[PDB]
């Protein structure tokens with residue numbers, strides 16, 4: 162595909178926006194609606210297609226509801242088949258929250274702009290919790306969240322390439338390693354709560370500039386989580402099929418971390434979030450200090466809400482509705 166190309170008397174190709182594992186996305190001009198659109202083209206094999214067909218069904222299912230909460234999700238306009246390649250057409254958006262982080266030289270955005278991103282994102286999760294919908298994203302992270310307009314702070318979610326309805330699971334190795342939840346590490350079955358774990362991890366990083374849990378492999382990842390939150394509740398490890406990839410059971414019935422050939426890893430639960438945020442010490446690297454809106458009383462409300470998102474037990478973890486009513490959002 163090259164600049165100039167006309168497709169079936171309607172779409173005029175301009176350029177490549179993005180690559181992917183699924184195929185290519187492009188910038189084209191529609192002559193019926195007379196507006197610019199983004200076209201995502203699937204690679205021509207039996208494998209990507211079948212998943213794509215699911216992506217389309219899940220998007221259409223969402224277009225049918227018309228609530229005040231569906232406006233935090235990218236809008237799908239059309240789909241059609243051409244030169245044996247499934248093609249999806251969406252509205253144009255701006256750059257993503259990773260580029261944004263990279264333009265601060267990884268120093269982070271304000272608490273006040275962090276709050277505005279969290280509010281919008283808790284709303285989108287509450288929309289997918291609609292009983293007649295019940296959708297799990299399975300791949301939340303900065304790259305998959307886009308600004309609506311480069312002048313403004315409105316956002317929307319994209320890439321429903323891994324998504325699945327409650328009780329329709331295909332794979333067990335899902336999510337991006339940095340944003341993977343403890344139940345998926347322990348090979349247990351998953352519901353909607355895994356997307357709320359990812360949000361916690363994302364929000365911390367948008368204020369500090371660096372990831373919360375940056376593992377180089379599955380064993381590395383779990384150890385950087387025990388550093389902050391300690392050993393998980395016994396009742397959970399006793400059901401988890403891959404609990405002995407990370408821990409050991411004792412005669413009385415208590416668990417501990419496994420052996421390892423030693424220059425890293427602090428003791429369980431001693432890397433308190435308290436210092437990762439710099440609550441009583443003027444923010445990350447005390448870079449705020451002078452700055453107004455970054456008072457100690459506002460920092461404790463952020464700390465409390467993050468720690469409700471990083472509960473090990475997914476039955477007792479906080480849900481979209483109750484998070485929108487937290488003291489951190491109160492005026």
Ligand SMILES: Nc1ncc(Cl)c2sccc12
Pocket residue numbers: 178179186199235251252253254255319
């Ligand atoms: N600019 C964009 N608008 C919409 C979508 Cl879905 C995508 S995917 C890559 C860039 C981009």
